Design an enzyme around this catalytic site. Sequence first.
Site, PDB file in Angstrom:
ATOM      1  N   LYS A  64       0.817  -1.205   0.000  1.00  0.00           N
ATOM      2  CA  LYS A  64       0.000   0.000   0.000  1.00  0.00           C
ATOM      3  C   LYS A  64       0.849   1.252   0.000  1.00  0.00           C
ATOM      4  O   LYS A  64       0.474   2.241  -0.626  1.00  0.00           O
ATOM      5  CB  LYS A  64      -0.926   0.042   1.214  1.00  0.00           C
ATOM      6  CG  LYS A  64      -2.111  -0.875   1.155  1.00  0.00           C
ATOM      7  CD  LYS A  64      -2.833  -0.847   2.481  1.00  0.00           C
ATOM      8  CE  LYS A  64      -1.923  -1.313   3.597  1.00  0.00           C
ATOM      9  NZ  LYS A  64      -2.561  -1.203   4.922  1.00  0.00           N
ATOM     10  N   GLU A 100       2.025   5.338  10.914  1.00  0.00           N
ATOM     11  CA  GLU A 100       2.856   4.489  10.073  1.00  0.00           C
ATOM     12  C   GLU A 100       4.307   4.582  10.535  1.00  0.00           C
ATOM     13  O   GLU A 100       4.609   5.138  11.588  1.00  0.00           O
ATOM     14  CB  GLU A 100       2.691   4.873   8.603  1.00  0.00           C
ATOM     15  CG  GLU A 100       1.476   4.251   7.962  1.00  0.00           C
ATOM     16  CD  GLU A 100       1.555   2.742   7.951  1.00  0.00           C
ATOM     17  OE1 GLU A 100       2.635   2.205   7.620  1.00  0.00           O
ATOM     18  OE2 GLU A 100       0.547   2.088   8.287  1.00  0.00           O
ATOM     19  N   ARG A 101       5.206   4.002   9.753  1.00  0.00           N
ATOM     20  CA  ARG A 101       6.611   3.992  10.130  1.00  0.00           C
ATOM     21  C   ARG A 101       7.232   5.367   9.929  1.00  0.00           C
ATOM     22  O   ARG A 101       7.019   6.013   8.899  1.00  0.00           O
ATOM     23  CB  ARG A 101       7.362   2.941   9.319  1.00  0.00           C
ATOM     24  CG  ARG A 101       6.782   1.552   9.481  1.00  0.00           C
ATOM     25  CD  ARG A 101       7.540   0.524   8.678  1.00  0.00           C
ATOM     26  NE  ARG A 101       6.933  -0.796   8.795  1.00  0.00           N
ATOM     27  CZ  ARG A 101       6.093  -1.312   7.911  1.00  0.00           C
ATOM     28  NH1 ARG A 101       5.748  -0.650   6.820  1.00  0.00           N
ATOM     29  NH2 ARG A 101       5.586  -2.521   8.126  1.00  0.00           N
TER      30      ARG A 101
HETATM   31  N1  LIG Z   1       4.627  -3.049  -6.944  1.00  0.00           N
HETATM   32  C1  LIG Z   1       5.453  -3.833  -6.249  1.00  0.00           C
HETATM   33  N2  LIG Z   1       6.532  -4.349  -6.874  1.00  0.00           N
HETATM   34  C2  LIG Z   1       7.361  -5.135  -6.176  1.00  0.00           C
HETATM   35  N3  LIG Z   1       7.289  -5.515  -4.903  1.00  0.00           N
HETATM   36  C3  LIG Z   1       6.204  -4.986  -4.311  1.00  0.00           C
HETATM   37  C4  LIG Z   1       5.262  -4.161  -4.895  1.00  0.00           C
HETATM   38  N4  LIG Z   1       4.282  -3.811  -3.979  1.00  0.00           N
HETATM   39  C5  LIG Z   1       4.645  -4.423  -2.881  1.00  0.00           C
HETATM   40  N5  LIG Z   1       5.801  -5.150  -3.009  1.00  0.00           N
HETATM   41  C6  LIG Z   1       6.475  -5.955  -1.970  1.00  0.00           C
HETATM   42  O1  LIG Z   1       5.657  -5.974  -0.821  1.00  0.00           O
HETATM   43  C7  LIG Z   1       6.354  -5.370   0.296  1.00  0.00           C
HETATM   44  C8  LIG Z   1       5.372  -4.622   1.156  1.00  0.00           C
HETATM   45  O2  LIG Z   1       5.229  -3.286   0.680  1.00  0.00           O
HETATM   46  P1  LIG Z   1       4.561  -2.146   1.596  1.00  0.00           P
HETATM   47  O3  LIG Z   1       5.442  -1.872   2.759  1.00  0.00           O
HETATM   48  O4  LIG Z   1       4.196  -1.016   0.718  1.00  0.00           O
HETATM   49  O5  LIG Z   1       3.241  -2.880   2.102  1.00  0.00           O
HETATM   50  P2  LIG Z   1       2.062  -2.318   3.039  1.00  0.00           P
HETATM   51  O6  LIG Z   1       0.775  -2.878   2.576  1.00  0.00           O
HETATM   52  O7  LIG Z   1       2.192  -0.845   3.138  1.00  0.00           O
HETATM   53  O8  LIG Z   1       2.458  -2.966   4.445  1.00  0.00           O
HETATM   54  P3  LIG Z   1       2.142  -2.416   5.937  1.00  0.00           P
HETATM   55  O9  LIG Z   1       0.643  -2.489   6.086  1.00  0.00           O
HETATM   56  O10 LIG Z   1       2.854  -3.404   6.825  1.00  0.00           O
HETATM   57  O11 LIG Z   1       2.708  -1.014   5.986  1.00  0.00           O
HETATM   58  C9  LIG Z   1       7.433  -4.524  -0.356  1.00  0.00           C
HETATM   59  O12 LIG Z   1       8.501  -4.250   0.530  1.00  0.00           O
HETATM   60  C10 LIG Z   1       7.828  -5.375  -1.559  1.00  0.00           C
HETATM   61  O13 LIG Z   1       8.648  -6.452  -1.130  1.00  0.00           O
HETATM   62 MG   LIG Z   2       2.844   0.546   4.509  1.00  0.00          MG
END
Ligand SMILES: Nc1ncnc2c1ncn2[C@@H]1O[C@H](COP(=O)(O)OP(=O)(O)OP(=O)(O)O)[C@@H](O)[C@H]1O
Ligand SMILES: [Mg+2]
EC number: 7.1.2.2
Lengths: 207, 465, 53, 500, 92, 191, 28
Positions: free
Chosen positions: B154, B180-181
Amino acid sequence: SNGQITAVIGAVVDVQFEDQLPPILNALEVQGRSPRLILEVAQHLGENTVRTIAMDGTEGLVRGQNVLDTGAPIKIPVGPETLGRIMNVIGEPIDERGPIVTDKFAAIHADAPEFVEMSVQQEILVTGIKVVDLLAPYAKGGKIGLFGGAGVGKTVLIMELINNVAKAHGGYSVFAGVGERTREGNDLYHEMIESGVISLKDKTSKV
Amino acid sequence: SNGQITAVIGAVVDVQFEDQLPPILNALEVQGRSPRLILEVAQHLGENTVRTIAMDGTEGLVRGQNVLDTGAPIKIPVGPETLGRIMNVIGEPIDERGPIVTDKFAAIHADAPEFVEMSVQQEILVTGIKVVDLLAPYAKGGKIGLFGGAGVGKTVLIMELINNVAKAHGGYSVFAGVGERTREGNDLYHEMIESGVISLKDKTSKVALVYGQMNEPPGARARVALTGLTVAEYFRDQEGQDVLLFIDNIFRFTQAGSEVSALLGRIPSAVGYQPTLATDMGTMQERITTTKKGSITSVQAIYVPADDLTDPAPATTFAHLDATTVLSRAIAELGIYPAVDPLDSTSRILDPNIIGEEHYNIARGVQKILQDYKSLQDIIAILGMDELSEEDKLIVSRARKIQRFLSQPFQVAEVFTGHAGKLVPIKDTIKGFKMILNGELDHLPEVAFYMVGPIEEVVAKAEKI
Amino acid sequence: DYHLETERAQRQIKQKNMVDWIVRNVMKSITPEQERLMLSKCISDLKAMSIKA
Amino acid sequence: EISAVLEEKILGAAPKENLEETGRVLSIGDGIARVYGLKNIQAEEMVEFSSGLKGMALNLEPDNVGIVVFGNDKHIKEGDIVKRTGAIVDVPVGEELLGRVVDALGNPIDGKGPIGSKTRQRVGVKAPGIIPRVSVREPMQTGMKAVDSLVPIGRGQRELIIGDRQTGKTAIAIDAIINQKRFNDAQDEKKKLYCVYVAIGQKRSTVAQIVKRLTDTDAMRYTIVVSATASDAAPLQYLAPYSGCAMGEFFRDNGKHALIIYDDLSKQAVAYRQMSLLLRRPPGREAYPGDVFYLHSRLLERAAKMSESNGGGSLTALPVIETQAGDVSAYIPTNVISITDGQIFLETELFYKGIRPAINVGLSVSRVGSAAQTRAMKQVAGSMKLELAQYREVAAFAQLDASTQQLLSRGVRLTELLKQGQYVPMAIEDQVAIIYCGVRGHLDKVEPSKITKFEKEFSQHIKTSHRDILDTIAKEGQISPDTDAKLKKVVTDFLSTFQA
Amino acid sequence: AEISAVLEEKILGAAPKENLEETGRVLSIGDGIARVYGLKNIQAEEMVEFSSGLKGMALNLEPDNVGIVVFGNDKHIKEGDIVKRTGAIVDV
Amino acid sequence: ATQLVKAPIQVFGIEGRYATALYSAAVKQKKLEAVEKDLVQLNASLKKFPRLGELLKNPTLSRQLKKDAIGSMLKEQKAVDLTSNFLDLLTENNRLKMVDGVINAFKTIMAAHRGEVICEVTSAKPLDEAARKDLEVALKGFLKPGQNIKLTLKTDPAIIGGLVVSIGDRFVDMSIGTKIKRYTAALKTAV
Amino acid sequence: KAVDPIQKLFLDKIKEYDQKSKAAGGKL
Ligand SMILES: Nc1ncnc2c1ncn2[C@@H]1O[C@H](COP(=O)(O)OP(=O)(O)OP(=O)(O)O)[C@@H](O)[C@H]1O
Ligand SMILES: [Mg+2]
Ligand SMILES: Nc1ncnc2c1ncn2[C@@H]1O[C@H](COP(=O)(O)OP(=O)(O)OP(=O)(O)O)[C@@H](O)[C@H]1O
Ligand SMILES: [Mg+2]
C-alpha cells in the site's frame, strides 16, 4: 486461630476468622465433620473473610461451624511407607490397610527449583524397552505424554516401566490417578498387586 | 480559568476546573510541562470535572498539576507558509527549520459541508496503472481507498500515485502520515526534496506534510488526520485550489480511537471496538470532499486486521469512498504486483456513459473471464487440466494471460526488484486487453505477459524467448 | 573440580549452620534491660521524626 | 572470608525508616492489589510491599490505587503496608549487566553477586522521531548464510523470526549472538555489538542451557540475559521485554550498537492477556485486549537507527513469534509483521526434511535490502536470488529441457549450499566465497551430497595457502573481474587437485 | 433522586419554586443521551426542547430521571440546562 | 451549594454524601455537638439491642413502621430536629439499612474538625509507668498546632520486640521482629 | 554515628561465632 463458616454454596465455603487470617493455599479442617473435611484458601475477600474450596462434599455444613487452620498447606505423609498404599488428596489411607505411620510429612504446594539448582546437561532414561530406547528415548527430569487407551497394553506398559526403573535404576514410582474412574482404579490396583509391583505381604512394593 | 489534574489513566487525563468548564474539543495546555502537553476535552464528567485525551505522553503527570484553558480548540497554521513544512498533530513544526510564520490559523475540528455544497462532476483521473485505469478507474476530485493487509503493498502504491499524479498536478498537495513507520515519513520527505516538490532554499513548495506516527500515543494518532484535513480544507475553500490529500493510513486513526474507548468508560462494541466508530469515521470522512469552492482528490490507505474484510472498521470505510482498490495477499503470493483484487475493486466511475463504451465493455469482459477462471479453479485443483473442455482451456489460458498482464513494474518499486517502471497510457491499456480478449495473442507464452507495461513489450518479450 | 566442589559444599554447609546458630543465639540474646534500651531508642527515633515535620 | 561478606551485607542493609507515605492493602487476588492511601503517588510508579515484593501503580482511582504485582500473590495478605519509591518503573542499565542473568526487575538470578550499576532507566520511554532517525545502512551479521544473503538485516532494523514450535527460531537467535564475537574481539569499536536475550515464558532448564551455550562460546561477555520463565508471574513476563529494551536503549543512546532478541513475544502477549482478563478488561480478537498491537509497537519502535547528532547509535530487534500450524494470518503474527521491517519464516515441512535452517525464501523478505549488505555480498546475493527465483519457477511445474535441468541442478546445489550447521556461524568473507562458488557454476560437477565436504575443504584451503586472496578481497571490498578470473582458476585447480 | 441539591432542599424543607412538572434540568449528557431530572408530567415517546433549541425524545421513564435521545450534536447540551416538554409526540 | 468547612476529611460513598449533608446542616446552625451526641446515643442503643437493628433492617416491614419506631426511640433520647429530619430522610429513601455507616461516617468527621488524629501503637507486651507518657510527649510534637492525638494501644507477642506505630498518613515499622526478619532474609539471599 | 542496636548485636554475635570457630579450629 479459629474461624467460623459464614457461607456454603456448592463446593465454595466462605469462612470468617476473627483473628489473623490464614494465607492463600492454606489448609483448614472443619472441626465437626467425622470424615476429615479439608478446605483450601483461594483468595482474601476482605473484612477478615476467606474463600475456600472443599476437598470433599459439603452436605451438613452449618453457618458458624468451627474451622481450625493447620498453619500450612495440605500436608501428606511421605516416605517408603507410602509404597504399595493408596492415599487420597489429603493423604488419608484409602486402601483400607491401616495408618501409614510415616514420620515425614510434606505440603503439596511448593515452589519450582531455582535457576542455580537446574541441571545444565540432559541425560536419557533407559527404561529397558527397545522401541522406547531406540526411536523415542525418554529424558531424565522430563515429561513424556502417553497417547492411546483401551486395549493397547497401556497398563502393562506402565507396570513394566515401574518394574524396569526400580530393577535397573533403583528409583521408585508414583501413580497419580487424576479424575480416573473407580472401576479402572480398582482394576489397576489389583493388576499391580498381581504383577508384583505392589506387595501386600513384605516391603518390596515399588509404587 | 485554571484546572487541576485529578486522574491519569493511560492517555486519558481527568482535570477538574474551579470556576468555568472548557467546552468539548477545547485544547488545554498543561502547566509545568516542557514539551507542550495538550489535552483535548472529550466529555464533561460532571461535578466540574472534564475528561481529556492527551496529544502526547502522560508520564510524569502528578495529581493536582495545573492545566490552563486556551479558550479554543487545537488551532493549526494554515496558508502558503505551511507548504514544504512538517507538522505534528498540534501543528508545531517538527522539521527543524524554525517556526511557521503565518497569519492564518484554523481549528482542526470543523463541521462537514452541507448537502447544497456538493458537486457531481465525475471526470476520470488517469494514473498510468493498468489494473487501476481499467477495472476501477479514479475520478478527478473524489475519494480513493487502497485496502490492504500486512505486507501486500500500500505504501508502494501510495508512492506510485504520488510519482504519477502529484508531480504533474499543478495545484497543491498534502500528505498526512497517520500511525505508520517514521522511516517511511523520512524517506518520503527526502524523496520530495530530491524531486523538487519541496524547496528548502526558497518558496514554490507544493506539498505540506503532517506526521503523527505509530510511536505516538493513541491520542495523537486519533487527531493527526484531522490536522491534514484542516490543511487541505484551507487550500480548497479559502484559496479555491485543486488539492491532493494522501493519508496513510485511516485504520490507525480508527484504531487509536478504539484504544482510548475502554479508558473513557464506554461499553465496547462488537469484536471489542468503540461504539462510536461509525459516527467518528463519518464526521472525519465527510470533511474530505470536493466542493463548489475547490476540488480535493484524496487517496487513503486502509489496513485490514488479520486479512479480514468483514472487520467493522474497513466495512464502515467502504461506504465512504468512491473508488476502492482492494489488495489481496493471495495475489501477492503469486508474484503479481500490484496485488489488486480484480473482482473486489469498484469505482462507481465504471459506467459506459462516463468512461466510454469500449472501456466499460473491456473491463466487464475481463471481470467475467476472471470470475469464470475462479469458478473453474475448484475442478482444476482436483481433476487437473485434462478433464476440462476446449473452451475451459481457452478460458484458463486467457485468464492467466490477463492476470500476468495486470501486473506492472512500478518506478518506486525498482529498488525492490530492478525492473524499470512503466507508465501505461489508458488507450494502450484498453488496446492491450482488447487484444488479449479477442484471442489475438493466444500463441504467446504467459511469461511474456509478466511485468511489462504495454502490449508491445509483450510481443517483444515473446519474440525474445 | 572435585576439590572445588568439596570446598564449595563445605563452605555452603558452614554458612548454613552459622546462619541457623546466629538466628538461635539472636533469639537467645534478648535481655529485659536491653529491651528497655531499644524501646527507649525507638521512642527517641519516633520523637526525632516528629521534630522533622 | 565469609565474616567480611556478612559484615558488608549487614552494613549495607540500612532500613532508614523515615517519613514513608504508605497505604494499606484492601484486598489481594488475581495479581492485582488494591491499596487504600498513597495520595501523592504517580501513575506507573514503582512501589514496594511489606514482604519485599515490588509493584507498579497502574490505576489512580479516587478511593484506591490499583497495583500490578511483580511476583506471586501468596506473599501478600490483606492489610499489608505498601511503600512508594518515588520513581516511575525503571531498571538498572549499563555495562555492568554484561555477562549477567537478571530477572524482569534487574535482580541477578545467576548468583554472581550484586550488579554495580550506576544508572537506571525507565521502561516506558517514547521512541525517537523522524529527525533523530537516519536510514539503516550498517550491516548486522548473524553469520547465517541464508539470512546474510537473502533476508539481510541492518543495524536498527526490526526483523521477525516467525515459525512453529521446534523449528530453530532460538537457534538462529543464539547463532546471531555468537557470531558477534569476531566483531567484539576486534579493535573497531564501531562494529562491536552488545546483545540482549529476553527469555519470556520459557522453561528454566532451557534458559540454563542457553546460558551455558553462550558461556562455552564466550558470547556471554557481551550478552545480558533477561529471564522471565514459565513459573514466574505474568506481570514479570510482561515487564521483561521492556526491561531488556531499556538495557539495549542504554547502548543505543550512548553511541553503541545493540541487538536485542525477544524469545518469544507470543508468550508475552499470553501473559498480558492473562493480566487483562484478570483486570476484567473487554476481550477482542481471540480473547486478547485491544492494545496488544500498541504493546508490541511501543516495544519495537524503540529499536531504530539514530542520527549522527544523536551519537550514531542503534538498536536492532529480533522478535520471535510461535505460530500454530504455520498460520501467519493470525492476529499477533499479523501485528508484528505490520510493525517490523521484515520476517524470517521457518517451515516445519523443511525442518522435517533436514533442511536446517528451514528458512522459507519465498516468504522471508527484508524491506531494507541492499543498504544492509556489503558490496561483495550484495553482488553475489542478487545473482543468488535471481537463480533461486528461476529455480522456484521451474520446479513448481516440473513435478525435460537441458536448460530446465540445468536450472534445477543449480537450484538444488544452491539449496544444499545454504544449509548450515547449528552454533557455527561464518564470517562474511567465507559466506561471500561460498555463495560465489555456488553461483558461478563451480559446483556443476559436484554432487549435492558432497557440497558440505567441499565447503569445509575449500575453506581450509583458502585459509591455508590463499591468505593473499582474502587480503585482496578485504582491500577491494568486492570481486573485480580480474580477481573473479583468478578465483575461477584457483577453484578449478582445487577441484582438479581433490579428484583426478 | 438523591443529589446534593435535593438533599439540601429536603433536609431544610426548602420546597423549591421550580415546577418541574412541565420542565426539567439535565442531570447528565453524553453521546446523545441526556438524563434529565424533572419532567414529572412527561409521557413516553414525547418530544422535548432544550435550552439551545435542540429537540429530543423521551425513551426511558425511570423513577429517578428521564432518558432523552438527542436529535443533534450533544455539544450544545450542558448539565443543568432547562428542558421543556413540547406536549406532543413526533410528527412530520 | 452547601456551606461548611469544605470537607475537613475525604469521605466518599452515598453514606458519605448523607454525612456531609448532615454536617453542613448542623454547622449552618449551632447544633453540631448536639447531633453528634444523639447520633452516638442512637448508635449505642442500636448496638445494645440487636432486635432494634433487625427491625430496622427488615425489608418485609413497611417504612411507616420503621419511621414510627425511629421517632419512638428518638423521643426517649431527647433528640433535636436535625437528627429527626436526617433519620426521616434515611428511611424515606430506604437507606436506613446503612444507618451504621453514616454515623460511622459522622464519627469520621469531628476528628479532623476537633483535630483528633488516630494513632495506633502496637507493642510486644503492654507497658506502663516509664511508657505511655513519653509516647504521648513524642506524639505531641508530630502535629501542627490545633490538633490532638487519639491513641489506641495493642499488644502482640508475635512481633518479638520493638514497636509498630501507625498514623493517619504514614507508617513506620521500627520493630525488632521485622528488623531481624529482614536481616535474616538478606543474609539468606546474599550469603 | 546512629548505629542501630540490632546491627551492633548481629556484628557482636558474628565476632563471637568467629572467635568460637577459631577456638573450635574451624569445625562446625
Ligand atoms: N509493486 C510492487 N513491486 C514489487 N514488490 C512490491 C510491490 N508492492 C509491494 N511489493 C512488496 O511488498 C512489500 C510490502 O510493501 P509495503 O510496505 O508497501 O506494504 P504495506 O501494505 O504498506 O504494508 P504495511 O501495512 O505493513 O505497511 C514490499 O517491501 C515489496 O517487497
Ligand atoms: Mg505501509
Ligand atoms: N541449523 C541447525 N542444525 C542442526 N540442528 C538444528 C539447527 N537449528 C536448530 N536445530 C535443532 O532443532 C531443535 C529445535 O531448535 P530450537 O529449540 O532452536 O527451536 P525453537 O523454535 O526455539 O523451539 P521451541 O518451540 O521449543 O522454542 C534443537 O534440537 C536444535 O538443536
Ligand atoms: Mg525456542
